[PDB]
């Protein structure tokens, strides 16, 4: 179909012009909520502390990449610290940094991992993955966090976004290197 | 993107796998699923790249031992142009109405 | 919704499991997609 | 004036249509006759577009200059396969001819489908208009479109040899490029599709 | 026991029919799937008989002797043309196999259509009967007839390479000519016809 | 009963011709689905990896043998890796081989074994146990797999076919050796 | 079906436990077996 592309109005076509059909599609796997609803490893704690910042997610992982594909987002959160450690503790967004959690929420370990559920605690209606605040581009606020955890020992930290909502899509780039080759190619799983 | 007085006529075809000498001429390529269109009032033309395969699903990645494209090729040809001073054609791609992805994977790293 | 599916249920109350949403006083892209032109500009022949 | 003609998996969209000229009939209705004993069959897969470059419309060619293309022509696709597998064949033609010049060029080509064209005198050229035709006039259009039915003293032809139809493109007024921005020549292309192809009398292909 | 099977302009009449064996299905119903995007088409012209000599059933061949013919085979007719013009194809097969011996000869051949036959051990031969089959027993018949549907992990095949079906004829009991008037050998011929052929993905034939 | 055996039409007879009955039969044990619905040991992992290929099943085992008795099949799958190892991970059919699973499905061990359930992930309507693709017989595609597992250590891998469907029967040969004897014979379980 | 029998049930939803089957738009051997001739060819006596 010819069209006046300048106006930017969407155009989506079948194969019917050429005599074709349309297959039945089931896009369950491209559902945003489903996609982000899994645990992603963000790394290890530091002095047995870790600020819960979704921007800590590895940017080439499925979750890190998708989260960054949106300008704004909202979600609740689940945490799981795996490692040999006794107890993970937590403080909400806006609390002063402490020397010891003592009395704030504390959860004891069970068979080497501590997993628990948290609520969105920011003071904003939604958070952003980018924020052009005083950083004049020429050709992230304190508040953007989900609290902080305190642990008894070093552990691997995993975050899981629950009830996720994304707004204003942003680019998602391929991360494999073509080298000089035209096609990309790798070894895919095959019977040995 | 060309000026008003520069006219051309194009064609795009879907070449199925195993086709031998990939056609290099409009004449030969006309034997494939194709579309021809010319310039005029409407600047944009949209083409539908179909899905043919033995299987219902294809892989997004290419196995190391894969010499030819298991899914074939798409060839874009210029049948003719008034003026040899270029007229740029911006090419763009979007999902069709029945496109679908399955099996999420975190292919992570190096 | 999401990637959670227990035919049975959830043991703790809603006010503890999740944060409660509020309102004052909607899928842009679905709508945008829905609105795309899928016809034919000009006349068709044969 | 945007018109898209489609045949099979092939389409053609023009933005300077001037209409279709139907020659001698509005349709190619197929009436089976006794010559095939009812064994003829239609092969729709063959009814699709194929392209050819006919010539370059240039500044030196004068009135009367003529280029022809006898049909059926050599085909490297499905249509051509029919010829090797069957002894008899019949079909009509959907013809699109184009000459891409700028609106700042001048001149005029006459495009016509002439039946049984064995020879043409120069005087007969002044009367080519008695045949189904259209015009390519730069100021106005870059596309011609003529649709004609199968024709002949026989219901079917015995594979080529006999060219019932011959496409003829002839210069009426010479091409011009007197306004600086025009082009110095216009390539002339043909987009054809066989219609209602019925074949009969199968024989072995190969050996 | 006179039965005439016909496909297109080709017929076959046998006077020693023993019935048709339908394998795995009574019909080859074609259910179009998403792999062809609805662009596949049937080409009936291809659905006709072609013949081949398989081998000579002789007195020295012993139990276990096996002759196979992988399908699709090389074709010098219409069916073969499809392979050059289209990338994907699917069809079933109507198979007739014969061994013309006299009623004064003895022995027995087993005829079967086996799917995905990459290799066969000698022990597996004792169980070839789990596959659609029939018998050629001189005292009784000179004709076998098996009809099978298209089969495969994929709705279509990408032109040959993959031979979903392999015809297998194997000696069960050795041929005999102990009664003076029999023949010393029996030629084994195959009469096959592709059924429900649907192709898709057109490409240029020739160059 | 006499019959024209050449035509291959089935013939199944009673003992009634001789004055007999017919016993009540209960063929629950020859039900294909039931039969294949059990765990079979396919072996150990390699570099702490193992492609899930049902053709890895031991061909003389009940499951290996029966699976091979069909040309085509379909099923879902359950896996159990037994051994002292921490965690088994998995990737679906068609994914590139990775250096580390990290972020793809991971399941931690519990008392020395890790068991989990998977879905058929091939792109074909059904799979085959044999495939005459370019291997001209004279008298298995990459795609035929259920994914791949990655482990923390070496383990014994068990597969269990769920919801099994089999098509187009193939031969099942005896595997015991007669030696020269006429009958076969072994020591059967008996009171000592 | 199969070799699974819990009078009670299954805890996780179907979309997670198994793959979902689809259709476009049947036990050959049972039928084949059913069709076998089990009578007597010729006439019976006594």
JSON list of C-alpha atoms in Angstrom, two decimals, chain A residues 1-6 11-15 18 21-30 34-35 38 58 60-63 175-176 183-190, chain B residues 33-35 37-38 42-48 50-51 56-57 59 61-67 94-109:
[
{"chain": "A", "resi": 1, "resn": "UNK", "atom": "CA", "xyz": [0.00, 0.00, 0.00]},
{"chain": "A", "resi": 2, "resn": "UNK", "atom": "CA", "xyz": [1.13, 3.42, -0.91]},
{"chain": "A", "resi": 3, "resn": "UNK", "atom": "CA", "xyz": [0.61, 6.00, 1.83]},
{"chain": "A", "resi": 4, "resn": "UNK", "atom": "CA", "xyz": [1.64, 9.48, 2.92]},
{"chain": "A", "resi": 5, "resn": "UNK", "atom": "CA", "xyz": [4.29, 8.27, 5.35]},
{"chain": "A", "resi": 6, "resn": "UNK", "atom": "CA", "xyz": [5.23, 11.78, 6.48]},
{"chain": "A", "resi": 11, "resn": "UNK", "atom": "CA", "xyz": [0.31, 1.06, 8.64]},
{"chain": "A", "resi": 12, "resn": "UNK", "atom": "CA", "xyz": [0.09, -2.70, 9.24]},
{"chain": "A", "resi": 13, "resn": "UNK", "atom": "CA", "xyz": [-0.61, -5.12, 6.40]},
{"chain": "A", "resi": 14, "resn": "UNK", "atom": "CA", "xyz": [-1.48, -8.83, 5.76]},
{"chain": "A", "resi": 15, "resn": "UNK", "atom": "CA", "xyz": [-0.35, -11.07, 2.98]},
{"chain": "A", "resi": 18, "resn": "UNK", "atom": "CA", "xyz": [-0.75, -11.53, -2.50]},
{"chain": "A", "resi": 21, "resn": "UNK", "atom": "CA", "xyz": [-4.06, -15.72, 5.10]},
{"chain": "A", "resi": 22, "resn": "UNK", "atom": "CA", "xyz": [-3.23, -14.61, 8.64]},
{"chain": "A", "resi": 23, "resn": "UNK", "atom": "CA", "xyz": [-2.17, -17.04, 11.29]},
{"chain": "A", "resi": 24, "resn": "UNK", "atom": "CA", "xyz": [-3.67, -17.21, 14.72]},
{"chain": "A", "resi": 25, "resn": "UNK", "atom": "CA", "xyz": [-1.37, -15.40, 17.10]},
{"chain": "A", "resi": 26, "resn": "UNK", "atom": "CA", "xyz": [-0.83, -15.88, 20.82]},
{"chain": "A", "resi": 27, "resn": "UNK", "atom": "CA", "xyz": [1.34, -13.11, 22.22]},
{"chain": "A", "resi": 28, "resn": "UNK", "atom": "CA", "xyz": [1.52, -14.34, 25.83]},
{"chain": "A", "resi": 29, "resn": "UNK", "atom": "CA", "xyz": [5.32, -14.25, 25.71]},
{"chain": "A", "resi": 30, "resn": "UNK", "atom": "CA", "xyz": [5.52, -10.56, 24.83]},
{"chain": "A", "resi": 34, "resn": "UNK", "atom": "CA", "xyz": [4.70, -11.69, 32.59]},
{"chain": "A", "resi": 35, "resn": "UNK", "atom": "CA", "xyz": [8.13, -10.96, 31.21]},
{"chain": "A", "resi": 38, "resn": "UNK", "atom": "CA", "xyz": [10.94, -13.28, 37.40]},
{"chain": "A", "resi": 58, "resn": "UNK", "atom": "CA", "xyz": [22.25, -6.01, 34.47]},
{"chain": "A", "resi": 60, "resn": "UNK", "atom": "CA", "xyz": [21.89, -6.95, 28.90]},
{"chain": "A", "resi": 61, "resn": "UNK", "atom": "CA", "xyz": [19.74, -9.41, 30.81]},
{"chain": "A", "resi": 62, "resn": "UNK", "atom": "CA", "xyz": [16.17, -9.96, 29.79]},
{"chain": "A", "resi": 63, "resn": "UNK", "atom": "CA", "xyz": [14.83, -8.00, 32.73]},
{"chain": "A", "resi": 175, "resn": "UNK", "atom": "CA", "xyz": [24.06, -6.77, 21.90]},
{"chain": "A", "resi": 176, "resn": "UNK", "atom": "CA", "xyz": [25.77, -9.49, 19.92]},
{"chain": "A", "resi": 183, "resn": "UNK", "atom": "CA", "xyz": [24.82, -12.66, 9.39]},
{"chain": "A", "resi": 184, "resn": "UNK", "atom": "CA", "xyz": [25.38, -13.21, 13.09]},
{"chain": "A", "resi": 185, "resn": "UNK", "atom": "CA", "xyz": [25.37, -17.02, 13.89]},
{"chain": "A", "resi": 186, "resn": "UNK", "atom": "CA", "xyz": [26.14, -18.95, 17.16]},
{"chain": "A", "resi": 187, "resn": "UNK", "atom": "CA", "xyz": [25.91, -22.54, 18.18]},
{"chain": "A", "resi": 188, "resn": "UNK", "atom": "CA", "xyz": [22.34, -23.34, 19.05]},
{"chain": "A", "resi": 189, "resn": "UNK", "atom": "CA", "xyz": [21.34, -26.28, 21.17]},
{"chain": "A", "resi": 190, "resn": "UNK", "atom": "CA", "xyz": [21.48, -29.49, 19.12]},
{"chain": "B", "resi": 33, "resn": "UNK", "atom": "CA", "xyz": [6.39, -13.27, -4.70]},
{"chain": "B", "resi": 34, "resn": "UNK", "atom": "CA", "xyz": [6.90, -9.58, -5.43]},
{"chain": "B", "resi": 35, "resn": "UNK", "atom": "CA", "xyz": [5.56, -6.06, -5.57]},
{"chain": "B", "resi": 37, "resn": "UNK", "atom": "CA", "xyz": [5.53, 0.37, -7.35]},
{"chain": "B", "resi": 38, "resn": "UNK", "atom": "CA", "xyz": [6.37, 3.74, -8.69]},
{"chain": "B", "resi": 42, "resn": "UNK", "atom": "CA", "xyz": [2.41, 9.04, -1.94]},
{"chain": "B", "resi": 43, "resn": "UNK", "atom": "CA", "xyz": [6.04, 8.76, -0.76]},
{"chain": "B", "resi": 44, "resn": "UNK", "atom": "CA", "xyz": [5.67, 5.58, 1.18]},
{"chain": "B", "resi": 45, "resn": "UNK", "atom": "CA", "xyz": [5.03, 1.98, 0.17]},
{"chain": "B", "resi": 46, "resn": "UNK", "atom": "CA", "xyz": [4.56, -0.97, 2.55]},
{"chain": "B", "resi": 47, "resn": "UNK", "atom": "CA", "xyz": [5.38, -4.60, 1.75]},
{"chain": "B", "resi": 48, "resn": "UNK", "atom": "CA", "xyz": [4.49, -7.83, 3.56]},
{"chain": "B", "resi": 50, "resn": "UNK", "atom": "CA", "xyz": [5.42, -13.69, 4.42]},
{"chain": "B", "resi": 51, "resn": "UNK", "atom": "CA", "xyz": [6.09, -16.74, 6.48]},
{"chain": "B", "resi": 56, "resn": "UNK", "atom": "CA", "xyz": [5.20, -23.56, 12.17]},
{"chain": "B", "resi": 57, "resn": "UNK", "atom": "CA", "xyz": [7.99, -21.69, 13.94]},
{"chain": "B", "resi": 59, "resn": "UNK", "atom": "CA", "xyz": [14.44, -19.67, 15.07]},
{"chain": "B", "resi": 61, "resn": "UNK", "atom": "CA", "xyz": [19.17, -17.16, 15.85]},
{"chain": "B", "resi": 62, "resn": "UNK", "atom": "CA", "xyz": [21.42, -18.81, 13.23]},
{"chain": "B", "resi": 63, "resn": "UNK", "atom": "CA", "xyz": [23.27, -22.01, 14.08]},
{"chain": "B", "resi": 64, "resn": "UNK", "atom": "CA", "xyz": [27.00, -21.96, 13.42]},
{"chain": "B", "resi": 65, "resn": "UNK", "atom": "CA", "xyz": [26.76, -24.61, 10.69]},
{"chain": "B", "resi": 66, "resn": "UNK", "atom": "CA", "xyz": [24.29, -22.78, 8.48]},
{"chain": "B", "resi": 67, "resn": "UNK", "atom": "CA", "xyz": [25.60, -21.82, 5.11]},
{"chain": "B", "resi": 94, "resn": "UNK", "atom": "CA", "xyz": [7.76, -3.41, 11.74]},
{"chain": "B", "resi": 95, "resn": "UNK", "atom": "CA", "xyz": [5.91, -6.51, 13.02]},
{"chain": "B", "resi": 96, "resn": "UNK", "atom": "CA", "xyz": [3.08, -7.79, 10.91]},
{"chain": "B", "resi": 97, "resn": "UNK", "atom": "CA", "xyz": [-0.41, -8.24, 12.37]},
{"chain": "B", "resi": 98, "resn": "UNK", "atom": "CA", "xyz": [0.14, -11.96, 12.95]},
{"chain": "B", "resi": 99, "resn": "UNK", "atom": "CA", "xyz": [3.76, -11.88, 14.07]},
{"chain": "B", "resi": 100, "resn": "UNK", "atom": "CA", "xyz": [4.61, -13.73, 17.28]},
{"chain": "B", "resi": 101, "resn": "UNK", "atom": "CA", "xyz": [7.54, -14.55, 19.60]},
{"chain": "B", "resi": 102, "resn": "UNK", "atom": "CA", "xyz": [7.84, -17.53, 21.99]},
{"chain": "B", "resi": 103, "resn": "UNK", "atom": "CA", "xyz": [10.35, -18.81, 24.51]},
{"chain": "B", "resi": 104, "resn": "UNK", "atom": "CA", "xyz": [11.83, -15.89, 26.45]},
{"chain": "B", "resi": 105, "resn": "UNK", "atom": "CA", "xyz": [15.59, -16.32, 27.00]},
{"chain": "B", "resi": 106, "resn": "UNK", "atom": "CA", "xyz": [18.22, -14.21, 28.74]},
{"chain": "B", "resi": 107, "resn": "UNK", "atom": "CA", "xyz": [21.07, -14.89, 26.28]},
{"chain": "B", "resi": 108, "resn": "UNK", "atom": "CA", "xyz": [23.36, -12.98, 28.51]},
{"chain": "B", "resi": 109, "resn": "UNK", "atom": "CA", "xyz": [26.97, -12.05, 28.06]}
]
